Design an enzyme around this catalytic site. Structure first.
Site, mmCIF file in Angstrom:
data_model
loop_
_atom_site.group_PDB
_atom_site.id
_atom_site.type_symbol
_atom_site.label_atom_id
_atom_site.label_comp_id
_atom_site.label_asym_id
_atom_site.label_seq_id
_atom_site.Cartn_x
_atom_site.Cartn_y
_atom_site.Cartn_z
ATOM 1 N N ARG A 34 0.781 -1.352 -0.080
ATOM 2 C CA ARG A 34 -0.086 -0.075 -0.100
ATOM 3 C C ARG A 34 0.991 1.361 -0.010
ATOM 4 N NH1 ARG A 34 -3.442 -3.540 3.274
ATOM 5 N NH2 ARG A 34 -5.720 -3.000 2.872
ATOM 6 N N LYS A 54 -23.722 -16.712 -0.949
ATOM 7 C CA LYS A 54 -25.241 -16.577 -1.074
ATOM 8 C C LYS A 54 -25.500 -15.826 -2.092
ATOM 9 C CE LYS A 54 -25.654 -16.549 4.107
ATOM 10 N NZ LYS A 54 -26.893 -17.072 4.230
ATOM 11 N N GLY A 82 -11.690 -11.055 -2.325
ATOM 12 C CA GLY A 82 -10.639 -11.622 -1.597
ATOM 13 C C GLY A 82 -10.279 -13.064 -1.995
ATOM 14 N N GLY A 137 -15.534 -3.805 -0.279
ATOM 15 C CA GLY A 137 -16.817 -3.120 -0.450
ATOM 16 C C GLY A 137 -16.962 -2.252 -1.551
#
Length: 390
Positions: free
Chosen positions: A35, A192, A345, A368
């Site tokens: 990062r 899901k 991920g 997200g």
């Protein structure tokens, strides 16, 4: 559009940069440099243009109004100093002013410590904005959240733009989602349907091929009327999956629901895969991977694609006996000359396992934010950057 570093005046300016320096820390030393190394091109451009760099980031999950040493960005400041080979001043009390000259780097303390960061209060946003002349948003991983150092600062700063990392990310995601080269194939895998329902609904009218994987595919198999036995699926989302299959049919979208599967009688790395036709799954068994005929269908489809959006595996690839489906998917994407965009991920874990990192066009490190972009949601940090461009 939105403004970029290349179209703003940075010479003798106090430039506030919002970076993703949420790096892991152990014994006062950072354990990852990825990062920090990623932000270097943005910082070097500001420095070469004659500006003053004021770095801003979040680190972990602290409580607003509670300074906690284990959440401090002092080890990140020290690491960046060792990487860029330039001094980096650490500003503990940054909000009360930052003394920085052109060609210097200053690291602010963690933003999330301040009151009103998550809420993006006008008081804190005005205070952050008063510290500089230019704001550079370069942390895509937080673009889906309206926070004072991501969203509010842009509202009050004279000039707001996007850094080299955020630019490249938005350029890549838009090249896959907004203006793709047809045919385009999207892979949506996961546990899901409910969790990726907004993704599936948004891609259905954008894609030519929609490949479903894992628990998502199992609910689609049950939607097609086959018994899935003890597999992971959502019986409450079966009716919704049938509607998705009907909408796809009308749209002319191809959903290659597995024709064969690899089942297990125990969910473990020791279990043996049994290749069965999709219609021959027993009450005892678990679909943990697609079968060989499904592998070849996905390969042949991805071969024709000019754009690939990858969000998830087609099986439990962590278990070698259930990794063949995702391995064949990964190699088909790797061999393709299509512009491929991967995120998630599990997707990155698959790319790493199958060693195809250098054969994916763009790999998103966001969680997200990548998903909310794929849902077709408008990210607040990108939106305020567009409003400030007008």
């Amino acid at each position: 559009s939105f403004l970029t570093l290349k179209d703003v005046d940075l010479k003798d300016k106090k430039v506030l940069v919002r970076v993703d320096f949420n790096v892991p820390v152990k014994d006062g030393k950072v354990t990852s440099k990825v990062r920090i190394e990623a932000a270097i091109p943005t910082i070097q451009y500001i420095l070469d243009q004659g500006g003053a760099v004021i770095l801003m980031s979040h680190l972990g999950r602290p409580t607003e109004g509670e300074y906690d040493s284990q959440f401090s960005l002092e080890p990140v400041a020290k690491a960046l100093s060792e990487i860029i080979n330039k001094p980096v001043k650490f500003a503990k009390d940054w909000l009360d002013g930052v003394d920085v000259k052109a060609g210097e780097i200053v690291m602010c303390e963690n933003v999330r410590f301040n009151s009103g960061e998550k809420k993006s209060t006008d008081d804190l946003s005005k205070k952050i904005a008063s510290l500089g002349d230019v704001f550079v948003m370069d942390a895509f991983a937080t673009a889906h959240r309206a926070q004072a150092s991501t969203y509010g600062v842009a509202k009050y700063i004279p000039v707001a733009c996007a850094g080299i990392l955020l630019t490249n990310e938005i350029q890549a995601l838009e090249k896959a989602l907004k203006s793709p080269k047809k045919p385009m194939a999207a892979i949506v895998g996961g546990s899901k349907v409910s969790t990726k329902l907004s993704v599936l609904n948004n891609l259905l009218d954008k894609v030519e091929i929609l490949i479903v994987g894992g628990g998502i595919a199992n609910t689609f198999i049950k939607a097609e009327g086959f018994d899935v036995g003890n597999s992971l699926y959502e019986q409450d989302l079966v009716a919704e999956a049938t509607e998705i299959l009907a909408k796809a049919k009308a749209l002319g979208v191809n959903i290659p629901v597995p024709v064969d599967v690899r089942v297990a009688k125990e969910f473990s790395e020791n279990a043996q895969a049994i290749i069965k036709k999709v219609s021959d799954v027993v009450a005892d068994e678990m679909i943990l991977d697609i079968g060989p005929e499904s592998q070849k269908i996905i390969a042949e489809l991805l071969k024709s694609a000019n754009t690939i959006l990858w969000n998830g595996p087609v099986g439990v690839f962590e278990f070698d006996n259930f990794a063949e489906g995702t391995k064949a998917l990964s190699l088909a994407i790797a061999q393709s000359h299509a512009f491929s965009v991967a995120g998630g991920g599990d997707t990155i874990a698959a790319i790493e396992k199958f060693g195809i990192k250098d054969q994916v066009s763009y790999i998103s490190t966001a969680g997200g934010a990548f998903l909310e972009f794929l849902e077709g949601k408008k990210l607040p940090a990108i939106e305020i950057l567009k409003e400030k461009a007008i």
